[PDB]
Every structure is written in structure tokens, then in C-alpha cells.
Design a protein around this ligand. Structure first.
Ligand SMILES: CC[C@@H](O)[C@H]1CCCN1c1ncnc2[nH]ccc12
Ligand SMILES: [Cl-]
Length: 167
């Protein structure tokens, strides 16, 4: 039993809700929140900008030190950093950016990072400004993640479309 509330069940392990991930994180304070990061951990907009803003820029300060030490992440890769005031940990995951020509096949690699954590609050990856189709991203999520994932979908119209077309 966990404290996530109001989710629709898609499969044994995947749950979905029309919600702002920032609000879900503040309310639930989960063990792991997933950020839809870029390789530079520059949290400018979308999920990352909103999460970082909610930490009063502490996420960005921590991230800049991470990059100065370790260099950029790989597309498809991840790192575990603090969740600040939103969660115990933040799993920063880089999906491919199709508007940059990056291989959409790397989206499966991105979701594989979720399997290192028993339970996560997450967005779909590679959608938003990363350019990919959210319907495809959900299929990859369901077919890749085996741990318990609670998906927060910001746009109500998209949520309704994802849950009406789900196979
Ligand atoms: C389908 C993927 C989409 O849901 C992602 C990509 C764009 C923004 N978005 C968000 N998701 C959840 N919570 C959010 N809070 C602020 C933004 C946001
Ligand atoms: Cl985004």
C-alpha cells in the first residue's frame, strides 16, 4: 500500500493520472520523482523547469556541481540526485530529443532506468518539447518498466486520449 490516490490502473505495474507532477510530488513526497532532463541538467522548462522552480533553484545548483564533476549524461541515461523538498530522491532521466535528431529507440533505454527503483512518480518521457508522440512513449513505458510507476500527465486532453486508445 502507498499514498498515491486517484490513479487509473493500466497494467499490473503502471498507473496514470491527469496531474501536474510538481503538485503530486509536493502532496505525496514520494521516494523517487523522475525528472525529464537533458544531458546538461539545464532545467529550463517543462517538467524540469517546473520541478527546479519548486525547489527554489536548489535542484539547478546541485545539478551544476554534478555536471562540473562528472560531465554530461548520455541520451538514454540517468543519475540519482536529491529530491529536495519534493521527494527523497530525483531520478534525472534523459529521453531522446527527436527535434535534435536523436534516435527514438533510445526512449526504451531511458525507461530502463526506472527498473532500478521499486516505485516512482514520473512523467512520460521524450514528449513535451522533446518532440515525441506521447502515445508512443506510453506504449514504450508499459512495455519496458516492470517496477511500479505512477504517471502524471499534465494535459487533460492528452490524458483522455492516452487512456481511451490504450491497448
Ligand atoms: C506527456 C508528457 C507531459 O505530461 C510533460 C512534458 C511537458 C510537460 N509535462 C508535464 N507533465 C507532468 N507534470 C508537469 N508539470 C509541469 C509540466 C508537466
Ligand atoms: Cl518537458
Amino acid at each position: 500500500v502507498n499514498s498515491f490516490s486517484g490513479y487509473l490502473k493500466l497494467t499490473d505495474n503502471v498507473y496514470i493520472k491527469n496531474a501536474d507532477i510538481v503538485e503530486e510530488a509536493k502532496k505525496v513526497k514520494p521516494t523517487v520523482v523522475v525528472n525529464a532532463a537533458n544531458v546538461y541538467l539545464k532545467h529550463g522548462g517543462g517538467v524540469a523547469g517546473a520541478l527546479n522552480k519548486a525547489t527554489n533553484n536548489a535542484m539547478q545548483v546541485e545539478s551544476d556541481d554534478y555536471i562540473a564533476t562528472n560531465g554530461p549524461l548520455k541520451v538514454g541515461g540517468s543519475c540519482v540526485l536529491s529530491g529536495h523538498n519534493l521527494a527523497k530522491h530525483c531520478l534525472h532521466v534523459v529521453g531522446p530529443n527527436v527535434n535534435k535528431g536523436e534516435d527514438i529507440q533510445l526512449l526504451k533505454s531511458a525507461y530502463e532506468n526506472f527498473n532500478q527503483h521499486e516505485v516512482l512518480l514520473a512523467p512520460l518521457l521524450s514528449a513535451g518539447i522533446f518532440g515525441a508522440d506521447p502515445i508512443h512513449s506510453l506504449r514504450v513505458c508499459v512495455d519496458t518498466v516492470r517496477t511500479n510507476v505512477y504517471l502524471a500527465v499534465f494535459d487533460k486532453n492528452l490524458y483522455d486520449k492516452l487512456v481511451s486508445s490504450f491497448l
